[PDB]
RNA sequence: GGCGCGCGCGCC
RNA sequence: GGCGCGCGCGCC
C-alpha cells in the first residue's frame, strides 16, 4: 500500500499521513490526533450559515509554521476534527522524490490513495484530543467558544 | 518561468509543452503544429449551440493512446486548433519532479505559468498543420465536414435573425 | 465550511 | 465548447 505525506503547499511542513484521512458524507477529515500540533486554531467570529447538530463548521485552521489558512475545524458527530482543504496540500509518496498537487479530492482518490468512510472507532480516537497541555487547552477554548456560539444560533433557529 | 509538460491525466501520454498554449478571448488553444499526432479527431454529429463564423466549436479530440476525451477542436479565424480541457490534463514540471491538476485554465495562469494572448504570428505555424500526411488529412476531413455543418446552421441563424 | 448538481446573463 | 459573473437545489 502506498502511503503519502500531506504537506503545506506553501512551506512544505508535514501535517499527517494519508492513512488518517477519512470521509464523513463527503467531508474529508483528519483522524490523527497528532495533527493538531501543526495547526493554529482561530475563531471566525461569525457562525456558519449551515446549522445542524451532527456537522458544525467552527474555527478556521492555519498552518502552524507559515500561518496560511489550510481549512476549517468542525464538530462532526460530537467530535472536534480538522478538515484540510485539498488546495492547501502537497502530497509526497513515502520514499519517492515526486510531489503532487490536486485540484479535487476525487483526483486524490483516483490517482494517489483510496479514502475510506470514517467509522465510529475513528471518531472515538479523536475525542478529547485537545487536553492536558497548555498548547492543547488554548485551542480547545477557541473551539469550545465557537461551538457554544453555533449551538446558540442552532437553538434559536429551532425555537420556531 | 518554468516549462511544463501537458499530459493525459488518464494514461500520462504527453501532448505538448506549456509554451504552446495561447488564449483567444479566454479559449486556451494549442499552437504546436505537432500536437495533432497525439490526438484522434472524432465528429460530434451535433452542431454547437454557439454559432459564429470566427470561433466554431467543432469535432471532439481524444487522447491518441487511451482515447479518453480530452477537449474539442475549434476553427478560430479560419484555422483549426485543439482546445485541451484542464480537466483531462496533468501538468508536469520535469526538473522539480512535480505534477499538478487544476480546476480551471485560470488557476494554471495563476499558479503555474504565464499564458499569452494569441497574435497573428501564432496562427501562421498552425495554418497547414493538417495538410501534410495521410493521417493528418483524415483529421482535416472530419473537421471540414463538421465546419460545413456548422456553417450551414449559422446561415439559418443569420438569416432569420434577419 | 465540504461534496455534488441546475438555471440565467456577458464576451469568444 | 471556453472563460467570467449571478441566482438557486440536494446530502452532510
Ligand atoms: Zn505552511
Ligand atoms: Zn491518454
CATH number at residue A74: 2.170.150.30
Distance CA A83, CA A75 (A): 10
In a domain, B143, yes or no: yes
In a domain, B54, yes or no: yes
From the CA of A63, the nearest ligand is 1
In a domain, B18, yes or no: yes
Q: How far is CA B44 from the centre of its chain?
A: 15
Q: Three cell numbers at A71? A: 481549512
- The resolution, in Å, is 1.6
Angle A11-A12-A18 (CA atoms, 0-180°, nearest 5)? Answer: 140
Distance CA B140, CA B101 (A): 30
A150: containing domain: 4-157
Strands B5-8 and B116-117: unpaired
Burial environment of residue B17 by CB neighbours within 10 A (0 to 12, 13 to 18, 19 or more): middle
In a domain, B121, yes or no: no
- CA–centroid distance, A69 to ligand 1, in Å, is 9
Distance CA B141, CA A33 (A): 61
* CA trace torsion B63, B68, B70, B76 (10° rounding): 70
Query: DSSP H helical segments within chain B, as ranges?
Result: 105-111, 120-126, 134-161
Q: Name which of B99, B104, B106, B110 to mutate to probe chain A: the one with the most chain A Cβ atoms within 10 A of its Cβ.
A: B99
Burial B81-119 (b: 16+ CB within 10 A, else e): bbbbebbbbbbbbeeeebbbbbeebeebeeebbebeebe
In a domain, B76, yes or no: yes
In a domain, B131, yes or no: yes
In angstroms, what is the C-alpha Rg of chain A?
16
Method: X-ray
Q: Which nucleotide is nearest to A52 (CA to C1')?
A: D12
Strand partners, B40: B62
Q: Which of B97, B101, B103 is opposite residue A98, by nearest beta carbon?
A: B97
Distance CA A9, CA A14 (A): 10
Q: Three cell numbers at A139? A: 485551542
Q: Are A50 and A57 within 8 A, CB to CB?
A: yes
**H or E element that contains A143:** helix A134-157
What's the longest Cα–Cα distance across chain B? 57
User: How many domains, chain B?
Assistant: 1
Distance CA A75, CA A151 (A): 11
Burial environment of residue B131 by CB neighbours within 10 A (0 to 12, 13 to 18, 19 or more): exposed
Q: Three cell numbers at A54? A: 451532527
Amino acid at each position: 500500500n502506498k502511503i503519502y505525506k500531506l504537506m503545506c503547499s506553501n512551506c512544505s511542513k508535514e501535517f499527517c499521513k494519508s492513512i488518517y484521512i477519512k470521509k464523513v458524507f463527503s467531508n474529508y477529515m483528519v483522524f490523527d490526533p497528532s495533527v493538531w500540533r501543526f495547526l493554529h486554531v482561530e475563531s471566525k467570529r461569525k457562525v456558519s450559515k449551515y446549522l445542524s447538530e451532527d456537522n458544525q463548521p467552527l474555527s478556521d485552521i492555519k498552518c502552524f509554521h507559515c500561518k496560511l489558512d489550510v481549512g476549517r475545524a468542525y464538530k462532526i458527530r460530537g467530535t472536534y476534527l480538522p478538515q484540510l482543504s485539498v488546495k492547501a496540500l502537497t502530497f509526497v509518496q513515502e520514499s519517492d522524490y515526486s510531489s503532487m498537487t490536486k485540484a479535487k479530492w476525487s483526483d486524490v482518490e483516483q490517482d494517489l490513495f483510496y479514502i475510506s468512510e470514517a467509522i465510529e472507532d475513528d471518531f472515538r480516537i479523536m475525542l478529547n484530543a485537545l487536553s492536558d497541555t497548555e498548547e492543547n487547552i488554548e485551542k480547545k477554548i477557541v473551539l469550545d467558544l465557537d461551538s457554544r456560539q453555533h449551538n446558540k444560533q442552532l437553538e434559536m433557529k429551532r425555537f420556531h
